[PDB]
C-alpha cells in the first residue's frame, strides 16, 4: 500500500499526488 | 515495526498539503 | 481561511492514530 | 465532514471514529 | 516505561490509556 | 539514540490526545 | 476553543524538547 | 496552569523551562 | 514577507516554491 | 502572536517538504 | 533515505522554536 | 553539518542555537 512505499524510500511530491482523489 | 508506524504519521500530513481541497486515499492494507 | 487550514492537519494526524489499520478518507 | 463539528468545538477519540473507515 | 513498550513495538490509544494522568 | 528521541515525541503528542484534561507525566528515564 | 486546544499539541512537543531527559509537569 | 499562560502569549524557552523538573 | 503571505490565506505547495533556495 | 506562531511551525514543516535537497529561506 | 529525511523534520521543527525571530537557514544536502 | 552532527547522536537545544542566523 502507500505505507509501503513511501515509507520504504522517500516518494517525491509527483508520486504522492498519485494519492490525491 | 514502530518506525513504519512513525513515517506514516508524517506520509498523511504530507499528503494532506500535497492534495489540498482534493482530499486523498488512506487505506494501508 | 488558514486557522482551518491548520485545524486540518491535527485532525488527519489523530485520525492516523485512531483509525489504524483501518485508514480513513479526508475530503475537507 | 467532521471540519465543522470538530474545528469549532473539540472532538474526543471517541467521536474521531466516527469518520473512520 | 512506555519508551521500552512502545518504541519497540505499536501500542494500542488503549495501551495509551495507562499512561495517563 | 535519535531513534528513541524521535519516538519520544509521537508519544508525547499521541498521550496529549488521549489523556485530555487529565494530563499525565512523561518520564523517560 | 479548539484554538487553545491545537496550541496545547504545540506546547507539549515544545516541552519535551526544552525539558530532556528530566521530563516535566503536564496538569492543564 | 500553562496552557492559558503560554497559549494566551507566547512562552519563551527560559518561561517553558519552568515546567521542567 | 511568507508571514503575511500564508498565514491569512493558504499558500499552495506551488506558491511555496517561490521560497526554496 | 500565538496565531503566527503555530502558523510558522506548519509553515517550515511545508516548506521543508517542498524544497527538499535544496533548503529555504526562513526569517520572519 | 528515510530515517534521515524524518529526522530532518523534527530538526526544522526544533530550530523553529529555537531560534525564533533570528531564524535559521537548513539546507540538508 | 547539522544532520550529521545531529541525526545519530541528540543534539541540545543548546547546541541546536549555534545554526540560528
Ligand atoms: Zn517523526
Ligand atoms: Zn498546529
Redesign the pocket.
Known sequence: GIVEQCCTSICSLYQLENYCN | FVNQH??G??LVEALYLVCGERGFYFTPK
Open positions: 512513525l513515517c504519521s508524517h
